[PDB]
Amino acid sequence: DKKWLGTPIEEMRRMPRCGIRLPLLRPSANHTVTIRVDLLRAGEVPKPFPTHYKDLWDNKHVKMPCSEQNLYPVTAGSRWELIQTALLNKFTRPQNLKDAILKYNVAYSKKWDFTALIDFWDKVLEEAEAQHLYQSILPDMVKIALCLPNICTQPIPLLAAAMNHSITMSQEQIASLLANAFFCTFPRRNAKYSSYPDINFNRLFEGRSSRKPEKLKTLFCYFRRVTAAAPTGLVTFTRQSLEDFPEWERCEKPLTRLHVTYEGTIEENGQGMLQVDFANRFVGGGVTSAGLVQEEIRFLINPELIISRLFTEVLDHNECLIITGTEQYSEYTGYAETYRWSRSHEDGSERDDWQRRCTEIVAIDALHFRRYLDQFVPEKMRRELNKAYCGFLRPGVSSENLSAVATGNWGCGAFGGDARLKALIQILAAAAAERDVVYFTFGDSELMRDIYSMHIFLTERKLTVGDVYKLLLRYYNEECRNCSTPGPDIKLYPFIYHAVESC
Ligand SMILES: Cn1c(=S)c2nc(SCCN3CCCC3)[nH]c2n(C)c1=O
């Protein structure tokens, strides 16, 4: 019968009800703000700040396609002029789009295949859908792309490694930038930035692929929406890089509350909660290429997430990316080979006092364990604890103003994570950051039961974060360290129950 266990989800904190009164939005040395704060009003398109386009072409900012410094060989010509000439043409067939994009990407004319775009347009779309694509949607996307200088007037700093910095920009600004990414206009981003994710969409168009046409349905749902009517809100992207981490073994904090369920999703059932993105260290993973599991799906249904790839350097072990305000534009079914775009989604989230949707997503990247027992090594357990802790902690916020963490089987698919260990690691990290946990087991009812049982066992016995961490070290030292097979003799949760009940 029972679809969920533990603390009722109704009793967990959510935004906006739990939220702090926000400070006045203003640019600072650690907060870039690309809109006119004095004119920010509910339901109105934000006005760019400054009024006139200002350019930076350097290693600390986005290199904009509209920069006068974006050149091509003719003598040098303006590549932005070339982009305008190429894209201001009628498309009636997919080859026309391919030919346009290659005009200003000539070096890639033999490297970039457009089979997946062709298949989408010719072999997936209905003829009327393809007509609407080339008569309306693509031209509207070109226009928002080419409007970039008037939209994104303020240089966008890179969120580089070790930076603790925030960018608050409009949904409209993101739309223009993403349209540029679709048309593969971002310079210097294709090459042999090896520490930044891909931003141009060329790999969405390549190869023989069934996933890619569904990815394109999802993205075109977004582009149809934001070109039909400008979006009015803001989004904040924050890189957080922590210098000091808990002494896990000495941590005297109690565990927090747990809701665990095998039904539901992070994105639908964790509304208003801190929603985990099971991230790649290159945020967004393979969203611009072949990937289509939890991170890439979130980045497709909330495409404003994708623009993080324009400016977010590969995450180090002590870092995360927190994104507040992205909008959900699509609904879907399935994942990977079964992923399908379903329909457009009208996001009903309330907005906060900075006109951000009350949706907060944190990109935290688990480790990939090629050997299963490697993850029980103390250094590896501590790495995961500290990553999750970085993702959950909000310095200078009372615990009563923190939403619950909405998560699931972080790093337990392709990355080889043990779901039971990962659950306890996230429970410990949440406890240390003084947040409750809402855990979605994605159809695994036995895992739901197991996590519930262990959590209530540890809490009833009033074990601290440190107490639990020491039991993990015990498990490593007694069952794993000197273990001579791919799996240990005794499983982790049974081991913990015995160790505590024997004491
Ligand atoms: C809780 N949760 C889960 S675990 C998840 N997995 C996916 S896609 C396949 C990825 N695999 C990674 C680890 C095992 C599954 N999408 C999901 N969503 C929306 C979700 O709420």
Residue numbers in the entry: 450 to 523, 531 to 648, 653 to 963
Task: Quote the paper.
PARG, a single gene alternatively spliced to generate five isoforms, is an endo- and exo-glycohydrolase that rapidly degrades PAR generated by PARP1 to coordinate DNA repair. PARG hydrolyzes α(1′′-2′) O-glycosidic linkages in PAR chains to release ADP-ribose and oligo(ADP-ribose) chains that may signal genotoxic stress. The hPARG active site has two deep pockets that specifically engage the adenine and diphosphate group of ADPR. Our high-resolution crystal structures of human PARG bound to these methylxanthine inhibitors revealed detailed interactions that support a mechanism of competitive inhibition.
The crystal structure of JA2-4 bound to hPARG refined at 1.7 Å resolution, identified a single JA2-4 molecule in the adenine-binding pocket. JA2-4 makes extensive site-specific interactions with hPARG, consistent with its potent inhibitory activity (IC50 of 0.9 μM). The methylxanthine head of JA2-4 makes π-stacking interactions with Phe902 side chain. The tail of JA2-4 extends from the 8´-position of the xanthine ring and is highly curved, which serves to make van der Waals contacts with Asn869. Structural superposition of hPARG bound to JA2-4 and ADP-HPD revealed that the methylxanthine core of JA2-4 occupies the same binding site as the adenine of ADP-HPD, consistent with a competitive block of substrate binding activity. Additionally, the 2´-carbonyl oxygen of JA2-4 hydrogen bonded with the main chain amide of Ile726. The most striking feature of the JA2-4 interaction with hPARG is a significant change in the Tyr clasp conformation. The JA2-4 binding site is obstructed by the side chain of Tyr795 in the unbound hPARG and in hPARG bound to ADP-HPD. To accommodate JA2-4, the Tyr795 side chain is flipped out from the adenine-binding pocket (with ~90° rotation), which positions the thioether of JA2-4 in contact with Cβ of Tyr795. Most notably, JA2-4 binding caused the Arg671 side chain to swing ~9 Å towards the tip of the Tyr clasp, where it makes an electrostatic interaction with Glu797 side chain and hydrogen bonds to the main chain carbonyl of Ala750 (not shown in this view).
